[PDB]
Amino acid sequence: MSREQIIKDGGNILVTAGAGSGKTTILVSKIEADLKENKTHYSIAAVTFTNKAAKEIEGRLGYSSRGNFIGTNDGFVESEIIRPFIKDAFGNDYPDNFTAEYFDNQFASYDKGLQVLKYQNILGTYSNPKKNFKFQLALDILKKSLVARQYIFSKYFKIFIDEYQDSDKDMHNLFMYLKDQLKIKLFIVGDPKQSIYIWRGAEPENFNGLIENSTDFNKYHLT
Amino acid sequence: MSREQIIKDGGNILVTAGAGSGKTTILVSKIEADLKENKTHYSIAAVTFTNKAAKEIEGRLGYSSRGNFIGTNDGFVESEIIRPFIKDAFGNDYPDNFTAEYFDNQFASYDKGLQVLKYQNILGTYSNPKKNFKFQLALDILKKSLVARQYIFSKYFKIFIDEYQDSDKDMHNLFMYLKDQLKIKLFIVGDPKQSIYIWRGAEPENFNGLIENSTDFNKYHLT
Amino acid sequence: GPMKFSNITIKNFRNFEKVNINLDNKNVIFGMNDIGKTNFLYALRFLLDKEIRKFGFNKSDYHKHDTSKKIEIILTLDLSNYEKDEDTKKLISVVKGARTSANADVFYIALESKYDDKELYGNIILKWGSELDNLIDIPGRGNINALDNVFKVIYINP
Amino acid sequence: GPMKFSNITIKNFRNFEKVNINLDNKNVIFGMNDIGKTNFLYALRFLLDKEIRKFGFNKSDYHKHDTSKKIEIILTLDLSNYEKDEDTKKLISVVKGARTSANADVFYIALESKYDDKELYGNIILKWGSELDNLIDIPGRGNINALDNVFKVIYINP
């Protein structure tokens, strides 16, 4: 019975779920179980691109005194990692409050993007649709700031990751940095057949390699 | 005795003070007297370019439950008139939080400045050193928003204005709009001999015309 | 007409399940259920008086002690005659922003509260403004809220 | 070494004019002036306990009843051994930002309060962080402060 396997969990869990949602109910069950068995100040982070998915996750879940974050990956980063520590990591000159618009710069060189971000306050994306600069900035702010690393270590003990096939190398590197260099548990679920956002920038080959090459993430089959 | 004339005040007061400060003590006395005799929710606004002047004004004054604003003209506007009501006047698309940098755009046409402000979020000044676009924006947001006019009318019953010879036509128009179209008392002090910021953008000829042509502002001579 | 109260949408209070009863400045409450009138008066105290907010909500303060539900009491105000009504000026001077130019007459003052089981103290989260759909962050400079400069409750009880 | 208290700079309290006395987790207060020890304990309650902040300060709570002065009690914390000290994790998880990378060991928790004569209620304005020079805006979501999730005072008195 797969319910016993779901309940017994244990460390990192990878589930090969099917299409037609399905991942939502196991995600909710895992979140509720982790909140119930926990008895410390450690929080949880569940991230999903779909806004209405975040709305329903918040609606079906009750009020938690300890801060549990529900939102999108870019919103998650720009909310807790970029916004507070941008002044601490890169000096008081860098702005703290800003809005993200992808269709402003459309640059070709990383140095030009760095200059326009530093001076004109404008934050956009590469001309190449692949990769997201926000997660590279998150890596940069994490690398040279011990405060950000300490906050991420202490706040979340297990970060829940959804629709990981949509992830590119940047947030993949961010999540691996949090898992390895910060020893933070990761709960990742992904559908191998959901490779439809490739044009949007998704490159799931790293996820498939982790499925095959990596050994820490045990593979589970759900009916 | 000029102390009796200072105490008796009455409506708008214009004082031809001398150099070597001097205006600071009469400003503090007028502010304290107005706060003491007042018994309602009406607040007061004293504005000065000199930051250390604002610091000493705050230091020598006590804590007030009712919000009394001490700051610079551009800071005053961008703080209470632009920041809150920018979304209400011009729709939710306009940004609410931003930083002012004068040396970014350096445009020549008003339409180009409007486009760059609307799209690229950048806020600067004209290539012409005269005039300030911030006060024109304040006029624009006041004209088409009844909420901003109501807030300005209800909050401050008398707005204190300092070093008015540094004022150009834009904040002159803003202050006259508040005085006439909003029936708000104005306490303005200025030195005719302090016309040294002309290159910075100051054009005191309007102030001298109000001294001569206007009749509502009574002229007072201080020893 | 001068500024007047319009409605209070008390939801999931001590006894009020879901009621939206109109108000107008001079109000009289009477009839059966003296506990109901007392709960209504304490709801007004919670929505307006700081001396009652600081104690927060308890398990008994909810409807049928069901902590799952959320207290939401929404006072509705009508604003008019700006140039002559002093109380309208008093209300609109403290509120900076959060007032859409489309409707400058209506003004909501809500009070959202959800119970947490990890501390057993339902926090009173004031969310006032002018439209139910969009609320900007309330200043809340310490214990004294921005509302505390507008509405002060004078409680009279022998 | 594990996280430990370092200093509390009590200024203009009920009896403390200007004192900066060191602390370390396990603290013992005794000697003359029982009112002094009571005032010290109530100062800690004001700085850490929400059940005492909500009542605010009074005229008697200041030094020599002089309302002109400002209460400023600044608790100083020392942070170290991040990976093994659970209480360090508890303190640094709630604080988001306001921690300069230059000094991740020191952590100030101040409490500024100025008396207003128009309402006779000195508001408790918490301003905590990591450096005295620069303080970012405290969340303060309603009655419960962000500090309330870290430090809870268990008051024991027969």
UniProtKB/Swiss-Prot annotation, chains A, B:
Entry comment, domain topic: Contains a UvrD-like helicase domain.
The organism of origin for this protein: Bacillus cereus (strain VD045)
Effect of deleting the gene: When this gene is missing the Gabija type I system does not confer resistance to SpBeta in B.subtilis. When this gene is missing the Gabija type I system does not confer resistance to T7 in E.coli.
Gene: gajB
Subunit organization: Homodimer. Interacts with GajA; 2 GajB dimers dock at opposite sides of the GajA complex to form a 4:4 GajA-GajB assembly (GajAB). GajAB interacts with Bacillus phage Phi3T Gad1 protein; this interaction forms a 4:4:8 GajAB-Gad1 complex and leads to GajAB inhibition.
Full protein name: Gabija protein GajB
Similarity comment text for this entry: Belongs to the helicase family.
Residue span relative to the full protein: 1 to 223 of 494
Domain UvrD-like helicase ATP-binding: residue ranges: 1-223
Site description Interaction with GajA, residues in chain: 147, 150
Residues involved in ATP binding: 17-24
Function: Component of antiviral defense system Gabija type I, composed of GajA and GajB. Expression of Gabija type I in B.subtilis (strain BEST7003) confers resistance to phages phi105, phi29, rho14, SpBeta and SBSphiC. Expression of Gabija type I in E.coli B (strain ATCC 11303) confers resistance to phage T7. May be a helicase or contribute to GajA activation.
Curated annotation (Swiss-Prot), chains C, D:
Subunit text: Homotetramer. Forms the core of the anti-phage defense complex. Interacts with GajB; 2 GajB dimers dock at opposite sides of the GajA complex to form a 4:4 GajA-GajB assembly (GajAB). GajAB interacts with Bacillus phage Phi3T Gad1 protein; this interaction forms a 4:4:8 GajAB-Gad1 complex and leads to GajAB inhibition.
Gene: gajA
Protein name: Endonuclease GajA
Site label Interaction with GajB, positions: 96, 99
Residues spanning the membrane: none
Role of this protein: Component of antiviral defense system Gabija type I, composed of GajA and GajB. Has no detected ATPase activity. Expression of Gabija type I in B.subtilis (strain BEST7003) confers resistance to phages phi105, phi29, rho14, SpBeta and SBSphiC. Expression of Gabija type I in E.coli B (strain ATCC 11303) confers resistance to phage T7.
Domain notes: The N-terminal ATPase-like domain seems to have lost ATPase activity, but may still bind nucleotides. The C-terminal Toprim (topoisomerase/primase) domain probably has the endonuclease activity, but when expressed alone (residues 348-578) has not activity, showing it requires the N-terminal ATPase-like domain for function.
Outcome of gene disruption: When this gene is missing the Gabija type I system does not confer resistance to SpBeta in B.subtilis.
Binding-site residues for ATP, renumbered to this chain: 34-38
